[PDB]
Scaffold this motif. Sequence first.
Motif, PDB file in Angstrom:
ATOM      1  N   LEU A 140     -73.478 -14.343  -6.373  1.00 18.35           N
ATOM      2  CA  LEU A 140     -72.613 -15.513  -6.198  1.00 18.35           C
ATOM      3  C   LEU A 140     -71.803 -15.854  -7.448  1.00 18.35           C
ATOM      4  CD1 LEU A 140     -75.110 -17.976  -4.382  1.00 18.35           C
ATOM      5  CD2 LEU A 140     -73.175 -16.774  -3.330  1.00 18.35           C
ATOM      6  N   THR A 141     -70.691 -16.563  -7.266  1.00 15.46           N
ATOM      7  CA  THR A 141     -69.958 -17.112  -8.405  1.00 15.46           C
ATOM      8  C   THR A 141     -70.749 -18.264  -9.003  1.00 15.46           C
ATOM      9  OG1 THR A 141     -68.605 -18.538  -6.944  1.00 15.46           O
ATOM     10  CG2 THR A 141     -67.648 -16.438  -7.640  1.00 15.46           C
ATOM     11  N   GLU A 142     -70.677 -18.416 -10.323  1.00 20.08           N
ATOM     12  CA  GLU A 142     -71.389 -19.507 -10.981  1.00 20.08           C
ATOM     13  C   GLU A 142     -70.938 -20.834 -10.379  1.00 20.08           C
ATOM     14  OE1 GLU A 142     -70.578 -19.900 -15.112  1.00 20.08           O
ATOM     15  OE2 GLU A 142     -71.859 -21.671 -15.347  1.00 20.08           O
ATOM     16  N   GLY A 158     -77.331 -29.129  10.789  1.00 27.74           N
ATOM     17  CA  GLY A 158     -77.218 -27.920   9.986  1.00 27.74           C
ATOM     18  C   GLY A 158     -76.774 -28.090   8.541  1.00 27.74           C
ATOM     19  N   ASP A 159     -76.326 -29.289   8.181  1.00 32.45           N
ATOM     20  CA  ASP A 159     -75.856 -29.558   6.821  1.00 32.45           C
ATOM     21  C   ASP A 159     -77.006 -29.563   5.819  1.00 32.45           C
ATOM     22  OD1 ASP A 159     -73.253 -29.882   7.773  1.00 32.45           O
ATOM     23  OD2 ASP A 159     -73.477 -32.054   8.012  1.00 32.45           O
ATOM     24  N   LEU A 160     -77.115 -28.502   5.020  1.00 32.23           N
ATOM     25  CA  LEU A 160     -78.191 -28.408   4.036  1.00 32.23           C
ATOM     26  C   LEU A 160     -77.690 -28.582   2.602  1.00 32.23           C
ATOM     27  CD1 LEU A 160     -80.532 -25.593   5.399  1.00 32.23           C
ATOM     28  CD2 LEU A 160     -80.882 -28.072   5.436  1.00 32.23           C
ATOM     29  N   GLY A 161     -76.443 -29.013   2.461  1.00 27.35           N
ATOM     30  CA  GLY A 161     -75.890 -29.325   1.156  1.00 27.35           C
ATOM     31  C   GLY A 161     -75.400 -28.113   0.389  1.00 27.35           C
ATOM     32  N   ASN A 162     -75.677 -28.111  -0.910  1.00 23.58           N
ATOM     33  CA  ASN A 162     -75.221 -27.058  -1.813  1.00 23.58           C
ATOM     34  C   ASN A 162     -76.377 -26.392  -2.539  1.00 23.58           C
ATOM     35  OD1 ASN A 162     -72.187 -27.095  -1.869  1.00 23.58           O
ATOM     36  ND2 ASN A 162     -72.567 -29.259  -2.333  1.00 23.58           N
ATOM     37  N   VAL A 163     -76.220 -25.106  -2.840  1.00 25.16           N
ATOM     38  CA  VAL A 163     -77.092 -24.431  -3.789  1.00 25.16           C
ATOM     39  C   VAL A 163     -76.259 -24.139  -5.029  1.00 25.16           C
ATOM     40  CG1 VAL A 163     -78.570 -23.370  -2.036  1.00 25.16           C
ATOM     41  CG2 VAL A 163     -76.536 -22.144  -2.878  1.00 25.16           C
ATOM     42  N   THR A 164     -76.924 -23.968  -6.163  1.00 27.14           N
ATOM     43  CA  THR A 164     -76.230 -23.735  -7.428  1.00 27.14           C
ATOM     44  C   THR A 164     -76.573 -22.369  -8.009  1.00 27.14           C
ATOM     45  OG1 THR A 164     -76.304 -26.119  -7.911  1.00 27.14           O
ATOM     46  CG2 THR A 164     -75.760 -24.641  -9.730  1.00 27.14           C
ATOM     47  N   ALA A 165     -75.544 -21.581  -8.312  1.00 22.42           N
ATOM     48  CA  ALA A 165     -75.725 -20.275  -8.939  1.00 22.42           C
ATOM     49  C   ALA A 165     -75.491 -20.357 -10.446  1.00 22.42           C
ATOM     50  CB  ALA A 165     -74.793 -19.243  -8.300  1.00 22.42           C
ATOM     51  N   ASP A 166     -76.307 -19.634 -11.206  1.00 24.03           N
ATOM     52  CA  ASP A 166     -76.184 -19.585 -12.663  1.00 24.03           C
ATOM     53  C   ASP A 166     -75.124 -18.589 -13.113  1.00 24.03           C
ATOM     54  OD1 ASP A 166     -77.263 -17.056 -12.443  1.00 24.03           O
ATOM     55  OD2 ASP A 166     -79.244 -17.597 -13.228  1.00 24.03           O
ATOM     56  N   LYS A 167     -75.067 -18.344 -14.420  1.00 22.12           N
ATOM     57  CA  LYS A 167     -74.039 -17.483 -15.002  1.00 22.12           C
ATOM     58  C   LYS A 167     -74.204 -16.018 -14.612  1.00 22.12           C
ATOM     59  CE  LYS A 167     -71.853 -18.172 -18.682  1.00 22.12           C
ATOM     60  NZ  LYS A 167     -70.430 -18.271 -19.111  1.00 22.12           N
ATOM     61  N   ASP A 168     -75.364 -15.680 -14.060  1.00 28.08           N
ATOM     62  CA  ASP A 168     -75.625 -14.323 -13.591  1.00 28.08           C
ATOM     63  C   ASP A 168     -75.422 -14.236 -12.077  1.00 28.08           C
ATOM     64  OD1 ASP A 168     -76.209 -13.498 -16.175  1.00 28.08           O
ATOM     65  OD2 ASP A 168     -78.383 -13.535 -15.909  1.00 28.08           O
ATOM     66  N   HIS A 183     -71.765 -20.293   1.526  1.00 32.95           N
ATOM     67  CA  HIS A 183     -70.312 -20.353   1.514  1.00 32.95           C
ATOM     68  C   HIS A 183     -69.668 -20.038   0.175  1.00 32.95           C
ATOM     69  CE1 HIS A 183     -69.228 -21.941   5.554  1.00 32.95           C
ATOM     70  NE2 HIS A 183     -70.501 -22.290   5.551  1.00 32.95           N
ATOM     71  N   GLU A 184     -68.359 -19.817   0.235  1.00 34.57           N
ATOM     72  CA  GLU A 184     -67.549 -19.428  -0.910  1.00 34.57           C
ATOM     73  C   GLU A 184     -67.436 -20.545  -1.940  1.00 34.57           C
ATOM     74  OE1 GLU A 184     -63.534 -19.219   0.242  1.00 34.57           O
ATOM     75  OE2 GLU A 184     -62.769 -18.389  -1.640  1.00 34.57           O
ATOM     76  N   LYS A 185     -67.263 -21.769  -1.452  1.00 34.57           N
ATOM     77  CA  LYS A 185     -67.045 -22.918  -2.320  1.00 34.57           C
ATOM     78  C   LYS A 185     -68.103 -23.985  -2.097  1.00 34.57           C
ATOM     79  CE  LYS A 185     -62.101 -22.144  -1.657  1.00 34.57           C
ATOM     80  NZ  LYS A 185     -60.867 -22.685  -1.021  1.00 34.57           N
ATOM     81  N   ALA A 186     -67.996 -25.077  -2.846  1.00 34.20           N
ATOM     82  CA  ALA A 186     -68.898 -26.206  -2.696  1.00 34.20           C
ATOM     83  C   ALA A 186     -68.612 -26.955  -1.398  1.00 34.20           C
ATOM     84  CB  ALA A 186     -68.762 -27.148  -3.880  1.00 34.20           C
ATOM     85  N   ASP A 187     -69.672 -27.430  -0.759  1.00 33.20           N
ATOM     86  CA  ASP A 187     -69.550 -28.303   0.401  1.00 33.20           C
ATOM     87  C   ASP A 187     -69.354 -29.728  -0.119  1.00 33.20           C
ATOM     88  OD1 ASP A 187     -69.855 -29.896   2.599  1.00 33.20           O
ATOM     89  OD2 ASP A 187     -71.866 -29.178   3.123  1.00 33.20           O
ATOM     90  N   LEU A 233     -69.840 -16.204   2.927  1.00 31.28           N
ATOM     91  CA  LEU A 233     -70.066 -15.039   2.079  1.00 31.28           C
ATOM     92  C   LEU A 233     -71.184 -14.147   2.594  1.00 31.28           C
ATOM     93  CD1 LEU A 233     -69.751 -16.708  -1.428  1.00 31.28           C
ATOM     94  CD2 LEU A 233     -67.983 -15.683   0.013  1.00 31.28           C
ATOM     95  N   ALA A 234     -72.226 -14.762   3.131  1.00 24.91           N
ATOM     96  CA  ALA A 234     -73.368 -14.004   3.609  1.00 24.91           C
ATOM     97  C   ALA A 234     -74.135 -14.862   4.590  1.00 24.91           C
ATOM     98  CB  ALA A 234     -74.252 -13.584   2.447  1.00 24.91           C
ATOM     99  N   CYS A 235     -74.923 -14.219   5.441  1.00 24.27           N
ATOM    100  CA  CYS A 235     -75.590 -14.928   6.513  1.00 24.27           C
ATOM    101  C   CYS A 235     -76.642 -14.033   7.136  1.00 24.27           C
ATOM    102  CB  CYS A 235     -74.569 -15.306   7.583  1.00 24.27           C
ATOM    103  SG  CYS A 235     -73.728 -13.869   8.287  1.00 24.27           S
ATOM    104  N   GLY A 236     -77.527 -14.631   7.924  1.00 18.43           N
ATOM    105  CA  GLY A 236     -78.538 -13.863   8.624  1.00 18.43           C
ATOM    106  C   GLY A 236     -79.148 -14.740   9.693  1.00 18.43           C
ATOM    107  N   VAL A 237     -79.857 -14.136  10.637  1.00 12.89           N
ATOM    108  CA  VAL A 237     -80.524 -14.918  11.669  1.00 12.89           C
ATOM    109  C   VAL A 237     -81.901 -15.367  11.175  1.00 12.89           C
ATOM    110  CG1 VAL A 237     -81.303 -14.966  14.066  1.00 12.89           C
ATOM    111  CG2 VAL A 237     -79.286 -13.607  13.419  1.00 12.89           C
ATOM    112  N   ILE A 238     -82.233 -16.633  11.401  1.00 12.85           N
ATOM    113  CA  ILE A 238     -83.533 -17.168  10.982  1.00 12.85           C
ATOM    114  C   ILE A 238     -84.624 -16.681  11.940  1.00 12.85           C
ATOM    115  CG2 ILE A 238     -84.854 -19.283  10.596  1.00 12.85           C
ATOM    116  CD1 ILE A 238     -82.161 -20.634   9.934  1.00 12.85           C
ATOM    117  N   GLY A 239     -85.651 -16.022  11.404  1.00  7.99           N
ATOM    118  CA  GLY A 239     -86.663 -15.410  12.247  1.00  7.99           C
ATOM    119  C   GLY A 239     -88.046 -15.965  11.991  1.00  7.99           C
ATOM    120  N   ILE A 240     -88.942 -15.805  12.961  1.00  5.99           N
ATOM    121  CA  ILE A 240     -90.321 -16.250  12.803  1.00  5.99           C
ATOM    122  C   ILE A 240     -91.053 -15.349  11.813  1.00  5.99           C
ATOM    123  CG2 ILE A 240     -92.501 -16.702  13.981  1.00  5.99           C
ATOM    124  CD1 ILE A 240     -90.866 -17.051  16.548  1.00  5.99           C
TER     125      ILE A 240
END
Lengths: 148, 128
Positions: free
Chosen positions: A38-40, A80-90, A118-122, A139-146
Amino acid sequence: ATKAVCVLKGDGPVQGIINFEQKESNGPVKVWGSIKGLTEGLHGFRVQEFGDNTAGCTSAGPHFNPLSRKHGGPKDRHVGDLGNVTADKDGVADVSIEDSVISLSGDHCIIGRTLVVHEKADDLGKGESTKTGNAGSRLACGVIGIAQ
Amino acid sequence: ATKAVCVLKGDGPVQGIINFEQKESNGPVKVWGSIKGLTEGLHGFRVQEFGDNTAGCTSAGPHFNPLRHVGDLGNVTADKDGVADVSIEDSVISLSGDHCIIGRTLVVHEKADNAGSRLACGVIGIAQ
């Protein structure tokens, strides 16, 4: 306790594994894992209605929104709104969320639906804002599984 | 849900899209689609307990069998081109209740339903 898992994959470097755990049907869901590539900075994190990945993330459909509400923050919102995650400099984002609106059972169940980063901040509907939070492309996605 | 869908993918060339439809609660489930990249002949077709593809198809768990077994969908048949067209009706699997397959893993095997390795798999998602 009910448990679930999701492998996030995209058309680039972005990938992740996200875990879910819920101790009781009426209780909060613990969400934890990591996403790389991800982008920082901030990235929208949400569940879409359908677990359809026939066209990658493009087919995941509308936001998961059983109550037909406006888009907002996790503490405000669509289910479905789970907010934002934060990526570091790596480009690595730690995910550690406890949410009481999503569920692994009942009408707010997210098992079988698509998790997306997502690409940008929500903008949490405080900015299209009351729709997709202006979070840009998926940017990326998957199906939630048991899981166990 | 009344419809589900699964994208099969693996480390090899096996790939497919399989649809599930159950217009009536507890009713028969229609299963259809196509899988390609297979060797000509029969291949085991199964639902695994977990929708966990963190280690590809190796993390999907045992075949679904709460308590034929529910997950045992018999065989698909690949032609000389390596394509298996699927059209099945199943009244054991379901899109709700104890036999719900949503969020679990669909798998296609190396050999007939002893089935050998899992060539491809995907998590079964809500489609409608």
